[PDB]
Short mmCIF file of C-alpha atoms in Angstrom, two decimals:
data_model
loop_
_atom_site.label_atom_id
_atom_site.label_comp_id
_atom_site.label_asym_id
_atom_site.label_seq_id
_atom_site.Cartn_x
_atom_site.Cartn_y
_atom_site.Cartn_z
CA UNK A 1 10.50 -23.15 -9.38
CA UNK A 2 11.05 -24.93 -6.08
CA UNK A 3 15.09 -25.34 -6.73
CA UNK A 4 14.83 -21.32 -7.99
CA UNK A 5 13.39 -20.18 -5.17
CA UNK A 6 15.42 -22.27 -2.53
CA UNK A 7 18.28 -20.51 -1.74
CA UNK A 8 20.06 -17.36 -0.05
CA UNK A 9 18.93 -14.11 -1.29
CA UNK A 10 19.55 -10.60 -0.03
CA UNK A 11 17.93 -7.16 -0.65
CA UNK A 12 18.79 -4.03 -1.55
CA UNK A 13 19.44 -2.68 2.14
CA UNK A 14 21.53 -6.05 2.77
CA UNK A 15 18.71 -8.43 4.48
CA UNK A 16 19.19 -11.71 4.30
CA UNK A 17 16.60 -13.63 2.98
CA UNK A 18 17.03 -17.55 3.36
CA UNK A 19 14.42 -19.89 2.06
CA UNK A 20 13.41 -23.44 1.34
CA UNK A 21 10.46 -23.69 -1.12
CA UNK A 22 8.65 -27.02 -0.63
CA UNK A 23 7.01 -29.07 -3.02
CA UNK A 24 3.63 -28.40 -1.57
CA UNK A 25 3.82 -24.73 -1.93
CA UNK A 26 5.10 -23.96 1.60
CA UNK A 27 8.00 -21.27 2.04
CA UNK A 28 10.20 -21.99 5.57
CA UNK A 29 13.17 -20.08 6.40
CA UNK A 30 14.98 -16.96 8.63
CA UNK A 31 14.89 -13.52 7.50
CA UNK A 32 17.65 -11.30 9.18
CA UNK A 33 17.27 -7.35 8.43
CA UNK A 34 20.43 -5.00 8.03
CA UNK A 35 17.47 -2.11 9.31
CA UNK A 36 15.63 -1.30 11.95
CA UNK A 37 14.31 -2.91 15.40
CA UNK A 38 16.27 -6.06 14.75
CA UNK A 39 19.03 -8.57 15.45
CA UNK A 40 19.60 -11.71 13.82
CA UNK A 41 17.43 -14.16 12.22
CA UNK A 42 13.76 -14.31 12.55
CA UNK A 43 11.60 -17.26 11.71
CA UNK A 44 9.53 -16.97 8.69
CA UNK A 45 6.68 -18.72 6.75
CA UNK A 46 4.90 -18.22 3.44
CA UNK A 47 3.89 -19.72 0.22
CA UNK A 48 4.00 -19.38 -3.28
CA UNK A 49 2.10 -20.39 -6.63
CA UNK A 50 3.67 -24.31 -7.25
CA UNK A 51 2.11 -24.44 -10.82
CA UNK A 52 2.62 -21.42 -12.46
CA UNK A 53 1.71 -20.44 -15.86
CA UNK A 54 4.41 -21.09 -18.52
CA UNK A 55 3.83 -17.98 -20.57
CA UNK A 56 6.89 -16.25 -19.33
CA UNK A 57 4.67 -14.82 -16.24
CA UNK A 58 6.68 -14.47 -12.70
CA UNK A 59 5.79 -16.60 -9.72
CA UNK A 60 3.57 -15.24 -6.63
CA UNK A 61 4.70 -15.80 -3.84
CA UNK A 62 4.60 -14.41 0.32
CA UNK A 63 5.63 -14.72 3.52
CA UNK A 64 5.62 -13.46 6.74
CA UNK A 65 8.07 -12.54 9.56
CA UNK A 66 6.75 -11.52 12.92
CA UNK A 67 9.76 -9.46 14.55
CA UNK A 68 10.27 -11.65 17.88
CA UNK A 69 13.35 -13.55 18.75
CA UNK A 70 15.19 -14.41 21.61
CA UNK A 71 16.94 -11.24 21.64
CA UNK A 72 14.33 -8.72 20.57
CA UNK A 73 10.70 -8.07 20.56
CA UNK A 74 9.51 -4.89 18.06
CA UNK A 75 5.97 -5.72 18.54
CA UNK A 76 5.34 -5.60 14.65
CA UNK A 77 5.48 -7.74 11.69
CA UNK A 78 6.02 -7.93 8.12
CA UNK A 79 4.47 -9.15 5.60
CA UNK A 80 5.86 -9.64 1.69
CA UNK A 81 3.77 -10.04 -1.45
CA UNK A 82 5.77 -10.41 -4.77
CA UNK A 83 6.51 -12.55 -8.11
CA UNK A 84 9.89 -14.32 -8.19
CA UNK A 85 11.27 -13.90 -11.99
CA UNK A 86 13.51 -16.36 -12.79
CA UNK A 87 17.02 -16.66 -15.68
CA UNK A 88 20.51 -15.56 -15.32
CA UNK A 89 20.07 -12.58 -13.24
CA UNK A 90 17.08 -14.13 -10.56
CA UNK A 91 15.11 -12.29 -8.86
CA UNK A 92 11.77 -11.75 -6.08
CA UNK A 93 9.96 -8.22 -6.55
CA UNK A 94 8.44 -7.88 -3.73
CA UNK A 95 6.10 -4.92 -2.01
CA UNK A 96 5.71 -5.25 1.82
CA UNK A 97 3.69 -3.85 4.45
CA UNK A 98 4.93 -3.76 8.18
CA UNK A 99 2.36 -3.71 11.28
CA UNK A 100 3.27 -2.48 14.60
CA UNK A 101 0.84 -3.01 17.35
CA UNK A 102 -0.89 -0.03 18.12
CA UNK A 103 -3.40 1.58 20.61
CA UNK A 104 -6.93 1.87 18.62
CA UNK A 105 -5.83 5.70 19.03
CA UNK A 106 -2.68 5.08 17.20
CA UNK A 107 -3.73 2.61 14.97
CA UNK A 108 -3.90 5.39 11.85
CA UNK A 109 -0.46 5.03 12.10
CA UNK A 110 0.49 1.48 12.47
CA UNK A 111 1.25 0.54 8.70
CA UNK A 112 4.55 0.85 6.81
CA UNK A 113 4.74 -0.18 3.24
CA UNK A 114 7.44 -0.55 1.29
CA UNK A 115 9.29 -2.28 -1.76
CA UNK A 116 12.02 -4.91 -1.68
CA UNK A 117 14.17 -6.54 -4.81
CA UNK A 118 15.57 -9.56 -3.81
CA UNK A 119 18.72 -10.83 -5.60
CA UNK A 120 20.93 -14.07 -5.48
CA UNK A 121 24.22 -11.89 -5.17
CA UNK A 122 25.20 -9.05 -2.75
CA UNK A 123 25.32 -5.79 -3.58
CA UNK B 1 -3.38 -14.14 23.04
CA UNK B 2 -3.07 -18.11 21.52
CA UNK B 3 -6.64 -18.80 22.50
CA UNK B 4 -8.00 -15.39 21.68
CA UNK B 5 -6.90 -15.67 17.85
CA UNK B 6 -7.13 -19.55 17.32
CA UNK B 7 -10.65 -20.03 16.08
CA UNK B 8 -12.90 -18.83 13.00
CA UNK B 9 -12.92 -15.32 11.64
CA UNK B 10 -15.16 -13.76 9.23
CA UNK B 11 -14.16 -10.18 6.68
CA UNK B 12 -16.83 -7.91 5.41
CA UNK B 13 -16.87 -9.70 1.97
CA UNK B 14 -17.68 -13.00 3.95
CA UNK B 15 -14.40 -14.51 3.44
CA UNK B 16 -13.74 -17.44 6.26
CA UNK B 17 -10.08 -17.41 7.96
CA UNK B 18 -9.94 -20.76 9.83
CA UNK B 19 -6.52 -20.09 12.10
CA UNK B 20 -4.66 -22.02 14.82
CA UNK B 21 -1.86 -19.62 16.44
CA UNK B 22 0.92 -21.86 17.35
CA UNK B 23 2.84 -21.15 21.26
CA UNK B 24 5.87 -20.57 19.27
CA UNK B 25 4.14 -17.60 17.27
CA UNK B 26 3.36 -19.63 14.35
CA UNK B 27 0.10 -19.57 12.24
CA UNK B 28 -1.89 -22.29 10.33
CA UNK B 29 -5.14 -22.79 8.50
CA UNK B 30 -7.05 -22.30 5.86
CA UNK B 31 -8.60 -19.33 3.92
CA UNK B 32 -11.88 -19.64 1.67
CA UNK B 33 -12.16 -15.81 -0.17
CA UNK B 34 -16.20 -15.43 -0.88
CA UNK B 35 -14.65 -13.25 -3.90
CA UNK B 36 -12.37 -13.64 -6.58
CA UNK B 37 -11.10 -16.05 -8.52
CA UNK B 38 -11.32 -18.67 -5.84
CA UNK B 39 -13.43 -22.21 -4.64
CA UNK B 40 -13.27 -23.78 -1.28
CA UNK B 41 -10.08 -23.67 0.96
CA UNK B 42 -6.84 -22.58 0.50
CA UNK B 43 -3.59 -23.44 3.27
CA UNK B 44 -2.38 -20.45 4.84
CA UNK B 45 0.81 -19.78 7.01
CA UNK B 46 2.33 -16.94 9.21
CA UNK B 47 3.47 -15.31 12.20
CA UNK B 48 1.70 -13.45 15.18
CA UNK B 49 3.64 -11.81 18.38
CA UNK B 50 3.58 -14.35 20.71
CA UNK B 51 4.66 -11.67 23.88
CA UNK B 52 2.79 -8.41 22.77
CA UNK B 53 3.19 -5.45 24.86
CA UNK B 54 1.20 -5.12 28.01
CA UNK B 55 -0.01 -1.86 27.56
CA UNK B 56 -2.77 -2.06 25.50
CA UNK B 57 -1.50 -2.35 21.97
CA UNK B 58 -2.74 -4.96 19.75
CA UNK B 59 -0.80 -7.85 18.83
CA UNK B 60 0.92 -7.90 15.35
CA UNK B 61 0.70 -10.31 12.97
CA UNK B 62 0.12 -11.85 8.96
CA UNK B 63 -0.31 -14.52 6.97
CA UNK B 64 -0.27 -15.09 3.30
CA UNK B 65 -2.30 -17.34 1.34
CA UNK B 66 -1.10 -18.72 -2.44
CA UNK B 67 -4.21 -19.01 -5.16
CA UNK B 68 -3.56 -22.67 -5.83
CA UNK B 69 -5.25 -24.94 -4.51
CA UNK B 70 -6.63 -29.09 -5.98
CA UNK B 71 -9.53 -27.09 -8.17
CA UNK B 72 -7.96 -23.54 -9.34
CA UNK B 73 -5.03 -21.89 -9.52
CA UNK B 74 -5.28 -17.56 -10.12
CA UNK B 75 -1.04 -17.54 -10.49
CA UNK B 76 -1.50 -15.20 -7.14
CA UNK B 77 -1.06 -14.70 -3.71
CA UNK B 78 -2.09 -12.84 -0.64
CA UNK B 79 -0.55 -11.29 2.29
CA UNK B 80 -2.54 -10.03 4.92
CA UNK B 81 -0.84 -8.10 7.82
CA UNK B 82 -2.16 -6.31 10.69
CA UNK B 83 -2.96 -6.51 14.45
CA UNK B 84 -5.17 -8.37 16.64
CA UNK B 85 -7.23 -6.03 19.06
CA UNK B 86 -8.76 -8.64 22.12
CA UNK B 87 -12.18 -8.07 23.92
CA UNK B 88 -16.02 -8.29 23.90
CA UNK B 89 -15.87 -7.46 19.72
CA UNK B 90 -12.37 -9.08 19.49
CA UNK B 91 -11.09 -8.31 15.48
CA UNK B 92 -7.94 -8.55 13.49
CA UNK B 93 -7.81 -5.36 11.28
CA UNK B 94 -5.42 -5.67 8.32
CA UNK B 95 -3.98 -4.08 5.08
CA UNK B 96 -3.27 -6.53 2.18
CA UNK B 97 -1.33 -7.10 -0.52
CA UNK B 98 -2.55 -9.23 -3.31
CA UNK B 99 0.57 -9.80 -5.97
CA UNK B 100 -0.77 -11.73 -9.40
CA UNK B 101 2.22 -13.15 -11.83
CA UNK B 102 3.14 -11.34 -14.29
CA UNK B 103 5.29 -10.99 -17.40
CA UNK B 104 7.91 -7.90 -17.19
CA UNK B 105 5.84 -5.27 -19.09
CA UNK B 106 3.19 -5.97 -17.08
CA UNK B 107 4.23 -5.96 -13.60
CA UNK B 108 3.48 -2.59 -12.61
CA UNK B 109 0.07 -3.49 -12.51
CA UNK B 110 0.59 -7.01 -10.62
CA UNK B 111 -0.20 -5.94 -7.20
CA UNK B 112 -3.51 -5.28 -5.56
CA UNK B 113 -4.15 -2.84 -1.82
CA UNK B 114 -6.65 -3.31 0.11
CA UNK B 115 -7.97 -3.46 3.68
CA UNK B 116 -10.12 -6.33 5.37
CA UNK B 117 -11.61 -6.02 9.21
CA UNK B 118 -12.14 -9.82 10.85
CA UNK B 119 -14.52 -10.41 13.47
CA UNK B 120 -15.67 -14.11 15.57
CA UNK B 121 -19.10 -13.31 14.29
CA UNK B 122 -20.60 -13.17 10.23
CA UNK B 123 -21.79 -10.23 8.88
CA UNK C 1 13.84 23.21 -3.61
CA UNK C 2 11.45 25.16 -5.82
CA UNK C 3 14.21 25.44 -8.50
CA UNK C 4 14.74 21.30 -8.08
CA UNK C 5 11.82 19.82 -8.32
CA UNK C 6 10.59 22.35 -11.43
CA UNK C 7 11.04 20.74 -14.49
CA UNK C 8 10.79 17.09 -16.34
CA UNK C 9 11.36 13.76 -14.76
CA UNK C 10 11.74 10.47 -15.96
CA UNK C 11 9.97 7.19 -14.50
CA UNK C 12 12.12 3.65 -15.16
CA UNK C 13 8.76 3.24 -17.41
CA UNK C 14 9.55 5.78 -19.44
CA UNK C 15 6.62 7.75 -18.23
CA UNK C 16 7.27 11.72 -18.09
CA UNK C 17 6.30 14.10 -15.37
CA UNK C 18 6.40 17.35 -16.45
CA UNK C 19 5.90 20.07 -13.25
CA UNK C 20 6.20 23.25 -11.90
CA UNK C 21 7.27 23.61 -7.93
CA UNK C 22 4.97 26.99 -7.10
CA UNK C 23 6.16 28.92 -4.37
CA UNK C 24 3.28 28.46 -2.05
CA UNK C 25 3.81 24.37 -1.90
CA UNK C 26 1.57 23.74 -5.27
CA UNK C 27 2.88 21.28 -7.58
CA UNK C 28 1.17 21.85 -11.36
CA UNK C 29 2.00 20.46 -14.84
CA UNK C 30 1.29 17.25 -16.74
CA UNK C 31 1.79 13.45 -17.03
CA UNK C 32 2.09 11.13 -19.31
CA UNK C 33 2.38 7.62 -19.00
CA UNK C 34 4.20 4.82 -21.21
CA UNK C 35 1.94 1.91 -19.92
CA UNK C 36 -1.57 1.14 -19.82
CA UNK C 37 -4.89 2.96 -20.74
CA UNK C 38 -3.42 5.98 -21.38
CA UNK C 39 -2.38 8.24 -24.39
CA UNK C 40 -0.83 11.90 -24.36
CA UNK C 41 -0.83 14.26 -21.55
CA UNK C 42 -2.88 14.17 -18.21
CA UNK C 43 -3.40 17.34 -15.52
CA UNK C 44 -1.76 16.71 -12.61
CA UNK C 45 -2.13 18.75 -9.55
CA UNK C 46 -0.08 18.27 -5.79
CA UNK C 47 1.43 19.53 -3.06
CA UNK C 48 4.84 19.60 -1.88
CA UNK C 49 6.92 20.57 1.49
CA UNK C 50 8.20 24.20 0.53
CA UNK C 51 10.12 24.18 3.55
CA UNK C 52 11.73 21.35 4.12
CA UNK C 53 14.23 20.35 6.80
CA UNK C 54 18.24 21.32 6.86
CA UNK C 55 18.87 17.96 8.02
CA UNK C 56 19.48 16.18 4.97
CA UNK C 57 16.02 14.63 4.57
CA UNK C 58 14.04 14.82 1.32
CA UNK C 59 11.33 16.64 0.28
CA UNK C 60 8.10 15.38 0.97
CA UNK C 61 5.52 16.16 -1.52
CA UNK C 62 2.48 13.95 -3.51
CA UNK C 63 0.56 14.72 -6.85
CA UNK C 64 -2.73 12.79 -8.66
CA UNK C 65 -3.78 12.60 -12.07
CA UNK C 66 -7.46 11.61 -12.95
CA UNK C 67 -6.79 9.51 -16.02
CA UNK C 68 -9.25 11.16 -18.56
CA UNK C 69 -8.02 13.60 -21.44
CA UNK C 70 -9.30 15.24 -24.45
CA UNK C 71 -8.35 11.20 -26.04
CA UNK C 72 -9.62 8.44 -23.49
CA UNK C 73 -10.91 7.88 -20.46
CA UNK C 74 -9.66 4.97 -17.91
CA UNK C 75 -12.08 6.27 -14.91
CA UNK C 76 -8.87 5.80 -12.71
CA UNK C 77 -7.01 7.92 -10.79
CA UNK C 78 -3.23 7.83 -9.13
CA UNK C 79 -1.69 9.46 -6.30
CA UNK C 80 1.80 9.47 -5.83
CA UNK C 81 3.32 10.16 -2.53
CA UNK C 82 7.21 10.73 -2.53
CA UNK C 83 10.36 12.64 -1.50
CA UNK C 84 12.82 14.27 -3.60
CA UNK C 85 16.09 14.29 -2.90
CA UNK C 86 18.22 16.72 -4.67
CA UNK C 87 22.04 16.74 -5.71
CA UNK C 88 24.31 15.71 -8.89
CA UNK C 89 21.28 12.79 -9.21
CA UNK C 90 18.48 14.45 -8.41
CA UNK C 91 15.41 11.87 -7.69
CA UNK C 92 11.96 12.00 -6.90
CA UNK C 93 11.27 8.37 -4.91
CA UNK C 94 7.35 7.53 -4.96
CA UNK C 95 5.08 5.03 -3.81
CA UNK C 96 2.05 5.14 -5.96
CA UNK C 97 -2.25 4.14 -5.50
CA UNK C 98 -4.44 3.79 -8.93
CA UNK C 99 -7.88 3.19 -8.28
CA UNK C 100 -10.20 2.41 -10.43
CA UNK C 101 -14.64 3.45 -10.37
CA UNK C 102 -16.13 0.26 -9.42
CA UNK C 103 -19.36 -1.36 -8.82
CA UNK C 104 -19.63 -2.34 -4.82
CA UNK C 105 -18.95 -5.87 -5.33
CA UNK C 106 -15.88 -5.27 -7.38
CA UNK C 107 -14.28 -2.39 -4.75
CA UNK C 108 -12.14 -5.18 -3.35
CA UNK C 109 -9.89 -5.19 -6.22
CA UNK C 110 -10.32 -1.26 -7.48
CA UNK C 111 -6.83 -0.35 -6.18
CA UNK C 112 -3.45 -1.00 -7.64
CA UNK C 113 -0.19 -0.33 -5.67
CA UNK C 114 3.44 0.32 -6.67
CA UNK C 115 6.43 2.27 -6.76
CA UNK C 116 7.97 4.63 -9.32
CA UNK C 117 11.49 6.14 -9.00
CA UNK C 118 11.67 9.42 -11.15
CA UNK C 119 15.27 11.10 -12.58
CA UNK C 120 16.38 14.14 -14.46
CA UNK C 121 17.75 12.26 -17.33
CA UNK C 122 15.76 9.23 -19.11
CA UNK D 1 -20.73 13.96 -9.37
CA UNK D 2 -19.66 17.97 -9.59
CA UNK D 3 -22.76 18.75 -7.22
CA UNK D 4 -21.82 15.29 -5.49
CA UNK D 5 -18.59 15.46 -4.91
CA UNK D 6 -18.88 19.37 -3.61
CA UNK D 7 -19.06 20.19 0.13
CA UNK D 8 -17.77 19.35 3.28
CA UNK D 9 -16.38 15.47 3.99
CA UNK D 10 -16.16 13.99 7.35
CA UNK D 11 -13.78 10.53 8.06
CA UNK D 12 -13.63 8.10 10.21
CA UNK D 13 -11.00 9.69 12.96
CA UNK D 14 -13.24 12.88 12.19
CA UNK D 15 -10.78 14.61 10.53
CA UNK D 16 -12.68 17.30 7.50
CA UNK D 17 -12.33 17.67 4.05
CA UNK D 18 -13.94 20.72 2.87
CA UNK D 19 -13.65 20.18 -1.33
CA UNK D 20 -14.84 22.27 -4.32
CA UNK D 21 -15.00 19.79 -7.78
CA UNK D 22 -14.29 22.04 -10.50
CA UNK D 23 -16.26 20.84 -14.34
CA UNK D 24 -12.96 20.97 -15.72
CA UNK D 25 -11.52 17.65 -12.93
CA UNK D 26 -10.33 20.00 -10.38
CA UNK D 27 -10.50 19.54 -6.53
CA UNK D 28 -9.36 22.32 -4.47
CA UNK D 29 -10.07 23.00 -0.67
CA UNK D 30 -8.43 22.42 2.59
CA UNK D 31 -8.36 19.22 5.30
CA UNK D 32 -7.93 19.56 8.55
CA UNK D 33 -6.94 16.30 10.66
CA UNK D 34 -8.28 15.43 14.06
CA UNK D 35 -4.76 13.20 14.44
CA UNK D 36 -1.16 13.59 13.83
CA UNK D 37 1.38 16.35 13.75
CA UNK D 38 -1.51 18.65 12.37
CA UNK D 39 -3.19 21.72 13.37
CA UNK D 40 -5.81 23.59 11.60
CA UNK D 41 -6.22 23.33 8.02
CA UNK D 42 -4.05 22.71 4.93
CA UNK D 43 -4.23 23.14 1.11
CA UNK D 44 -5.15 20.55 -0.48
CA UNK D 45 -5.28 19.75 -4.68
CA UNK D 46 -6.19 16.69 -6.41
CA UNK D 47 -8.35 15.26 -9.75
CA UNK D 48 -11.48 13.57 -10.25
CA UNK D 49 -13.00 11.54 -13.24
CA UNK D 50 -15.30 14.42 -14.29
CA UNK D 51 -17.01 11.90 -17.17
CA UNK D 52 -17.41 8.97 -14.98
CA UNK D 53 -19.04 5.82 -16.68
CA UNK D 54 -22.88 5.31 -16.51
CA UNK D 55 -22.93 1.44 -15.16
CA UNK D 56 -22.91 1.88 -11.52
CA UNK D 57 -19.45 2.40 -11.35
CA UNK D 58 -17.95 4.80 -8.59
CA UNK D 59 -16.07 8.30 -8.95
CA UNK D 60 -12.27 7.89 -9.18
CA UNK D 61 -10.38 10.87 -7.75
CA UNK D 62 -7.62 11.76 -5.67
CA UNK D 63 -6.23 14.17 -3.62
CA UNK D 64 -3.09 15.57 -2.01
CA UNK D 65 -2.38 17.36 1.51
CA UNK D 66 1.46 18.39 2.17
CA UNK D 67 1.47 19.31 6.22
CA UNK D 68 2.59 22.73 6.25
CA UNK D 69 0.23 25.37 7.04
CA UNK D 70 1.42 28.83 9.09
CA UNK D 71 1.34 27.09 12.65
CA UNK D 72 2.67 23.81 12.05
CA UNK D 73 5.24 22.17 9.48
CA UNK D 74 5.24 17.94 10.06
CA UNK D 75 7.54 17.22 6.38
CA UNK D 76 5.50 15.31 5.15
CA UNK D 77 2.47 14.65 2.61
CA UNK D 78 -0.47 12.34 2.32
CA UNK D 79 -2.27 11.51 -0.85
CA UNK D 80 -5.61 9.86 -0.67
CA UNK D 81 -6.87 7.90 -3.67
CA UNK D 82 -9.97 6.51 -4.30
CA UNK D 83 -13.57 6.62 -5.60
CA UNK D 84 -16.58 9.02 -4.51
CA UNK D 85 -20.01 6.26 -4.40
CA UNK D 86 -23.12 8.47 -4.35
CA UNK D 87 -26.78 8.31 -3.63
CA UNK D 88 -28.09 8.68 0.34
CA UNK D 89 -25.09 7.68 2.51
CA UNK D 90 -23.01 8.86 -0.19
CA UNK D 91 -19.15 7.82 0.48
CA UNK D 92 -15.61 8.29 -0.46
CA UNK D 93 -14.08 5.28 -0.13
CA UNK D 94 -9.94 5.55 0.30
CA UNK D 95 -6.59 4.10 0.30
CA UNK D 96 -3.79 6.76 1.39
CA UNK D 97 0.18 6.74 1.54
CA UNK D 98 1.85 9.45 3.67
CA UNK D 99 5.74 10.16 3.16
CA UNK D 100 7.77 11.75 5.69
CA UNK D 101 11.07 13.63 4.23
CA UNK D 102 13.72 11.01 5.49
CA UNK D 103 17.35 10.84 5.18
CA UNK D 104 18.42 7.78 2.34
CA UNK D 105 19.09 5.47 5.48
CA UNK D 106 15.71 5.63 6.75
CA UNK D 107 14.24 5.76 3.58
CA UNK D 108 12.55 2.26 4.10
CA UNK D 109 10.31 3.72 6.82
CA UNK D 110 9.33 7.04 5.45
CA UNK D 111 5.75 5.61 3.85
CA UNK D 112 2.43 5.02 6.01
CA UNK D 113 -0.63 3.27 4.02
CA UNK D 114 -3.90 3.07 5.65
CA UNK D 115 -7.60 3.89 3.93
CA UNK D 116 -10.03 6.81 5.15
CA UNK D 117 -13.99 6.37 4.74
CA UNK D 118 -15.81 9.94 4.41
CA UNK D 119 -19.08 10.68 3.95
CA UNK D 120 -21.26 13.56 4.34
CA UNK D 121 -22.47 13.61 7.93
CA UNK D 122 -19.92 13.33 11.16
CA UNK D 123 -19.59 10.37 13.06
#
């Protein structure tokens, strides 16, 4: 699923989601997010499952975006855990959970998580 | 905080996170879960807040880890994301997300939640 | 939103979540669920926000059910933890935690995660 | 675990979880939380595997807490779920998610995760 996964996909807030999947199991890319403490792209890194089964299962996959740039610093990052389901209508489930650094006094608090649907089309 | 996380951390299960953070806020190593269906090392990759805040917050970060590696493959990956808290008893507490491949009528049961504390010395 | 959230709601499972909204914040009525160990109706028990905000946020509110019944018995339990948001498509938008009894070595992986989005009409 | 389970719960922030387990799967009682936009106690209701199996196995059971009481409304609600271990330095062991009533644009940051440890003597 490396030429499946490769591509431009966007969620259901309007993040932009671009990826290269390598043949190694590496994911590269930039992640831009329509929400939040952000502005433009932000490096990420993952990896998925480069053998999956072939009993009609999904794909696991991850990555990561830490939300520093040159423009911004939110002192938090993200992290996505999902299967990418592949066919006519392709698509990465994903659930995430977002970190801010805390104080240990605040750190009860420092989790977000969340769920993300990645498609290849905008909605 | 490059040379406070590069190095060897250990979880409460006795899992071994082998990390080098990168001056450009990247992370790379290798994972070896004492639990699970898992053998030996696995390649990681993520992100960590290279210019945390200087107040006393911990520094954000995560890192996912893919199932697959030359002897097994569990059609799964990991995400790990959390915050790295420096000192005397430095750790890296985290929340993960463990997302297995699924078919359809089975993915609402295809992701794991947990929480794993890392310390520089073994339990 | 006592006369909102009262009633039966639909998961995109095809699970139904049958409650009364008490007065006093207490969610009560039954589940039951179209996937997994499971057969017939569950308790379920929760809490919501009977007095929410007039700024146009949601509702929060949370229920569990223990998954044993006069039928089975998965020794699991989920919590979901949500908002409703009323109007002409009413919703109630969860994020949900089953976990499971375990022995100690198996705790790691006692706890499943996910999301269910729950409508007036199935 | 009716006997077990009964009585007065202390986590890790040193919040309290005073809890009645009813032979019919009840739990009824009131939490009060040493963190947070909380003061005093609140209701709280939840279920509990009242026919747990005889292997070893833990408790499963969960509760919820919606913060409104008479002095204080935060709109908001946590539910804890997880498993009750017993024996000496009997535990409840927990994963929670707390939702904040959000508008639909900040819907993506209404839900904190984190995980609670309670047992049956105060840190």
């Amino acid at each position: 699923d490396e030429a499946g996964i490769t591509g431009t996909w966007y969620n259901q807030l309007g993040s932009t989601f671009i990826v290269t999947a390598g043949a190694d199991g590496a994911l590269t890319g930039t992640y831009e997010s329509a929400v939040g403490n952000a502005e433009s792209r932000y490096v990420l890194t993952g990896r998925y499952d480069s053998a999956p089964a072939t009993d009609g299962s999904g794909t696991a996959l991850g990555w990561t975006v830490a939300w520093k740039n040159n423009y911004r610093n939110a002192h938090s990052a993200t992290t996505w855990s999902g299967q990418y389901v592949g066919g006519a209508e392709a698509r990465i489930n994903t659930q995430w959970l977002l970190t801010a650094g805390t104080t240990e006094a605040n750190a009860w608090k420092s989790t977000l998580v969340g769920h993300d649907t990645f498609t290849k089309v905008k909605p």
